[PDB]
């Protein structure tokens, strides 16, 4: 019932199985042992969608992972607000600096 | 696809800088008269 976590940052992609947080877990892709594994998670790079984008299962020595992602290097997402507040905070800080300089210089 | 977004963000940044530069020049020109 505990959902999988995944953070696709740049080209390296992280996949973790938090079902067994007190041990180390192996990894397969279409029942084939698999670029490398980690202590608990998957550190994978040079991602592609045509290959290496299928069903993943973690197993120690019925919760299955299937994902697809168009990995884009040094490249993330931002909605309207995440860029709408940047101009607001810039205006706020420049106004604060202006007011401080004006008031301090009598 | 994923490149037009920077093209749209950079033009907004340049609009911001244009406003800032016009404010600078207006303030300096107004001060010169005093």
């Amino acid at each position: 019932q505990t959902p999988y976590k995944v953070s696709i940052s740049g080209t390296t992609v992280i996949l973790t199985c938090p079902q067994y947080p007190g041990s180390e877990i192996l990894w397969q892709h279409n029942d084939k042992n698999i670029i490398g594994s980690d202590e608990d998670h998957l550190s994978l790079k040079e991602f592609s969608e045509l290959e290496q984008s299928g069903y993943y299962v973690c197993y120690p020595r019925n919760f299955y992972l299937y994902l697809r992602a168009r990995v884009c290097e040094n490249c993330m997402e931002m909605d309207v607000m995440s860029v709408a507040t940047i101009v607001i905070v810039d205006i706020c800080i420049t106004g604060g600096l202006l007011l401080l300089v004006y008031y301090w210089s009598k | 696809t994923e490149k037009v977004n920077m093209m749209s963000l950079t033009v907004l940044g340049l609009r911001m800088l244009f406003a800032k530069t016009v404010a600078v020049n207006f303030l300096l020109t107004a001060k010169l008269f005093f």
Binding site: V87 | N5, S8
Partner: peptide, 28 residues
Amino acid sequence: LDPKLCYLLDGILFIYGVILTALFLRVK
């Protein structure tokens, strides 16, 4: 995306203009 770039700067600029006019009309 274009409406965002339309509204974001023009709001602040528009407000500026209004607050400037109001002052000019009040002084007059």
